[PDB]
Design a binder for this molecule. Structure first.
Ligand code: NAG
Ligand code: NAG
Ligand code: NAG
Lengths: 28, 50
């Protein structure tokens, strides 16, 4: 149900942390 | 210019930097390159005048 339109995502945060990320999870 | 808070500088089509953020103040500066142009000499013939 994601609404149509246009948006531009802005950088806020930068992490030098070098984590190898081959997977991810959502915290509800 | 309406710089967004993340922008350290702005640039023209030539990749030349048009504007910058200052590292010691939260201000955004336009940069205009220095006035220049051809020096053209209008002369009669050296037979007739210097
Ligand atoms: C990240 O982990 C995967 C294993 O799941 C491995 O194959 C991959 O080479 C690792 N990448 C880096 C940059 O360490
Ligand atoms: C530069 O120095 C001024 C005066 O102490 C200070 O207010 C400003 O936050 C400093 N800028 C940076 C980027 O540290
Ligand atoms: C310059 O040209 C004129 C002809 O118009 C001539 O009479 C004169 O002697 C010339 N002067 C020099 C320095 O060549």
């Amino acid at each position: 149900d994601l609404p149509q339109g246009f948006s531009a995502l802005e950088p806020l945060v930068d992490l030098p942390i070098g984590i190898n990320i081959t997977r991810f999870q959502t915290l509800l | 210019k309406k710089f967004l808070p993340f922008q350290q500088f702005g640039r023209d089509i030539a990749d030349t930097t048009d504007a910058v953020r200052d590292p010691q103040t939260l201000e955004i500066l336009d940069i205009t390159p220095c006035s220049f142009g051809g020096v053209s000499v209008i002369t009669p013939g050296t037979n007739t005048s210097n």
